[PDB]
Amino acid sequence: DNSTFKASATGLGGTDQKIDGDLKFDDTTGKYYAKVTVTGGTGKDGYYEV
Fold first, then answer.
1. Is residue 19 packed enough to be buried (19+ CB in 10 Å), middle (13-18) or exposed (0-12)?
2. Cβ neighbour number for residue 45 with a 10 Å cutoff
3. How far, in Å, CA of 31 to CA of 43, rounded?
4. Roughly how many angstroms between the first and final C-alpha of the chain, as a whole number?
5. What are the subcellular locations of this protein (predicted)?
6. DSSP-based three-state secondary structure for 41
7. Beta carbons of 9 and 17 less than 8 angstroms apart
8. What whole-number distance in Å separates Cα of residue 50 and Cα of residue 39?
9. Which residues pair with 48 in a beta bridge?
């Protein structure tokens, strides 16, 4: 569920922060990485460890 990222990651700022829809996974560490679009944040769109 991608909704709880918006309820937990309040320090990102902007106007509306949301994951692009699909969570990212790796081939080395198994770490979850969220593809985050931060509307209102100057250059904050990117991938975040989650």
1. buried
2. 14
3. 23
4. 12
5. Secreted; Bacterial flagellum
6. coil
7. yes
8. 19
9. 34
C-alpha pair distances (Å), 26 with each of 3, 12, 40: 22, 23, 28
| CA–CA separation, 15 and 48 (whole Å) | 18
This structure's resolution (Å) is 3.7
Residue 26's Cβ-side half-sphere holds a number of Cα atoms within 13 Å equal to 11
Q: How far is CA 42 from CA 4, 32, 48, in A?
A: 22, 24, 16
- The rounded distance, in Å, linking the Cα atoms of 7 and 27 is 28
**If you count them, how many residues does the chain have?**
50
This structure was determined by cryo-EM
